[PDB]
Amino acid sequence: MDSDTLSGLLENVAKKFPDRRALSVSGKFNLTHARLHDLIERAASRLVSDAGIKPGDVVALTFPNTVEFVIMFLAVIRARATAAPLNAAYTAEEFEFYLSDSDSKLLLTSKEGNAPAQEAASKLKISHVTATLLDAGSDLVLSVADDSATELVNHPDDGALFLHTSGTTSRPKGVPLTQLNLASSVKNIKAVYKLTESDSTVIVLPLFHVHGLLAGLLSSLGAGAAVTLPAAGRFSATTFWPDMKKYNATWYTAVPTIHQIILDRHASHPETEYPKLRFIRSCSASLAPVILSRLEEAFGAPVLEAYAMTEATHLMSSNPLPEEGPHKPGSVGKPVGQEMAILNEKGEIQEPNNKGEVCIRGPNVTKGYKNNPEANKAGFEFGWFHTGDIGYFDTDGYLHLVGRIKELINRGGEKISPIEVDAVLLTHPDVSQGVAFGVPDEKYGEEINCAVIPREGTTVTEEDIKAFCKKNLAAFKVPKRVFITDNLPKTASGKIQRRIVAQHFL
């Protein structure tokens, strides 16, 4: 059943599991694998014959998390074109930038449209086409005027997905990913979680970032499993568990800020009963051990943390299923389907429990950034990609992350991990959210500060937080200032970015 292209893999899946459920929209649609496969083939045929899409063309997509986004994403790639999913919330100026930078030749949206994206596409003279799924008796309707897919051969080295990085420690970089990149990551994710055709999940993350796209959507479809999209095209804490129950979910994946919202909802409105999940997954930012504990206690499933990035087509490492090995709080587990090494600044491989930069090598990894010869010369050596993250392997081969090189706090020669300190802040009884960050300091060069959101109806002082930290951290790691606030900025992906927080409180 496996294949070295995503389109090939999905074809094998449809043939093996044609009448199993593939894709539901809560309360509305329920597509089987054969039906979805044919909707995709027919749409790809229309893109080639009627929209003039040629191999290597880039097609931009901007949708909520909807059935048309799924169908058109896979139709674009099937037609040997490259999909460039874009955040629907961008301004017209942002859209103009990303449409130009990706070399998009076509913009797809829903029939309702997206006014800023349409404004940008018109200014750049890029065609705009809408996509609508009506009923089970009809093909997907495309707004382009009136077979041709069948002939098409998908090559592992064809471009398939073009994304930018989240912009956390830099200006977002452009990342081209191939059919082969996608197929490799789908095989890795399916393998480490043993996804099979009886699995089922609800998507709670944006499908324009690789976490929800690769793990939630594509790896499920690649196992013959099922995916449910929320009725309103985005995560809702109120409909999450009803959807998970109704559509027989067996797992879900989310980022720590979304897991915290789900936990809050469990505290204020517990369900009378929860489904028994095989596992709950967390990725994209560190999962504090206390959040892991809270999730296992609330929902009774093992919580497996993974480590991933856009340049790796998502998954690099994960804690294993309990039947294969332990999962370690504070750890992102073992490499899956790729090589990984910890290197010092001279490129020497480090022994266990010695820190260094995490480097990876594998068929899931991008061949290189688009139009950035310098980032490529800096980031790649003999096939290995330098992640920019500092970590170490313990003697079981489990990876422990210390943090991004650019985020470590250098206080008078001692480096502080903001990950470590965050994990402590979240254990304070009255802290609902917390983030540590570096700031300039005239005596030590850099100092650590933090910001916390108190739990509703509690009052928290800087001095309480600091005292609590002093009981749980070496003194040099204790935030010198604690900012108390009602809200922290997070990305569309759900990451709190420390540089933004820092600037905001200074």
Ligand X SMILES: Nc1ncnc2c1ncn2[C@@H]1O[C@H](COP(=O)(O)OP(=O)(O)OP(=O)(O)O)[C@@H](O)[C@H]1O
CA–CA separation, 343 and 487 (whole Å): 38
Note whether 401 binds ligand X by CB under 6 A.
Answer: yes
| β-pair partners for 342 | 358
| β-pair partners for 360 | 340, 385
Structure tokens at 376: 């490529």
- Do β-strands 303-309 and 279-282 pair in parallel, antiparallel, or remain unpaired? parallel
Window of 8-16, 281-289, 364-372, 457-465 that interacts with ligand X by CB under 6 A: 281-289
Note whether 255 binds ligand X by CB under 6 A.
Answer: no
Window of 244-252, 300-308, 335-343, 409-417 that interacts with ligand X by CB under 6 A: 300-308
Name residue, tokens 């804690």.
319
Number of helical (H) and strand (E) elements in the chain, helices listed first: 15, 26
Note whether 169 binds ligand X by CB under 6 A.
Answer: yes
Residue closest to 204 by CA, chosen among 244, 167, 164, 168: 244
389 binds, among Mg ion, ligand X, none (CB under 5 to 8 A by kind): ligand X
| β-pair partners for 132 | 141
- Cβ-based nearer residue to ligand X, 200 or 417: 417
Is 298 annotated to bind a ligand? Reply is no
| β-pair partners for 104 | 58
Note whether 285 binds ligand X by CB under 6 A.
Answer: yes
Residue closest to 210 by CA, chosen among 237, 189, 234: 189
Whether 225 contacts 198, CB under 8 Å: yes
Is 395 annotated to bind a ligand? Reply is no
| β-pair partners for 484 | 452
Q: Which residues of 412-427 are buried (b: 16+ CB within 10 A; e: fewer)?
A: eeeebbbbbbbbbbbb
CA angle (378 as vertex; 376, 379 as ends), nearest 5? 65
CA–CA separation, 349 and 101 (whole Å): 37
Distances 277 to 125, 286, 320, 382, 435 between C-alpha atoms, Å: 48, 22, 15, 41, 30
CA–CA separation, 287 and 330 (whole Å): 7
User: 170 to 199, contacts with ligand X by CB under 6 A?
Assistant: 170, 172
SS3 95: helix
Is 132 annotated to bind a ligand? Reply is no
Is 495 annotated to bind a ligand? Reply is yes
Note whether 121 binds ligand X by CB under 6 A.
Answer: no
Note whether 148 binds ligand X by CB under 6 A.
Answer: no
Question: Which residues would be at the binding site for Mg ion (CB under 5 A)?
Answer: 165
Note whether 307 binds ligand X by CB under 6 A.
Answer: yes
- Cβ-based nearer residue to Mg ion, 133 or 215: 215
- Cβ-based nearer residue to ligand X, 90 or 247: 90
301: number of Cβ within 10 Å: 20
For residue 173, the minimal CB distance to ligand X (Å) is: 6
The residue sitting closest to Mg ion, measured at its beta carbon, is: 165
Note whether 99 binds ligand X by CB under 6 A.
Answer: no
Using the rule CB under 6 A, which residue among 65, 387, 417, 433 binds ligand X?
387
Is 222 annotated to bind a ligand? Reply is no
For residue 360, the minimal CB distance to Mg ion (Å) is: 13
Residue closest to 334 by CA, chosen among 409, 383, 393, 380: 393
Is 239 annotated to bind a ligand? Reply is no
User: 435 to 494, contacts with ligand X by CB under 6 A?
Assistant: 493
Is 169 annotated to bind a ligand? Reply is yes
**One character per residue 329-348, x = contact with ligand X (rule: CB under 6 A):** ---x----------------
- Cβ-based nearer residue to ligand X, 325 or 329: 329
For residue 384, the minimal CB distance to ligand X (Å) is: 15
SS3 178: strand
305 binds, among Mg ion, ligand X, none (CB under 5 to 8 A by kind): ligand X
Whether 35 contacts 28, CB under 8 Å: no
**Residue 130 belongs to what H/E stretch?**
strand 127-132
Window of 52-60, 99-107, 165-173, 448-456 that interacts with ligand X by CB under 6 A: 165-173
SS3 392: strand
Using the rule CB under 6 A, which residue among 18, 55, 167, 337 binds ligand X?
167
Is 413 annotated to bind a ligand? Reply is yes
For residue 214, the minimal CB distance to ligand X (Å) is: 11
Q: Which amino acid is at 309?
A: M
Using the rule CB under 6 A, which residue among 53, 180, 309, 408 binds ligand X?
309
Q: Which residues are annotated as a binding site for CoA?
A: 234, 413
Q: Which residues are annotated as a binding site for oxalate?
A: 284, 309, 314, 495
Q: Which residues are annotated as a binding site for ATP?
A: 165-169, 209, 284-286, 305-306, 310, 389, 404, 495
Q: Which residues are annotated as a binding site?
A: 165-169, 209, 234, 284-286, 305-306, 309-310, 314, 389, 404, 413, 495
- Contact positions vs ligand X (CB under 6 A): 165-170, 172, 283-286, 305, 307-310, 332, 387, 389, 401, 404, 493, 495
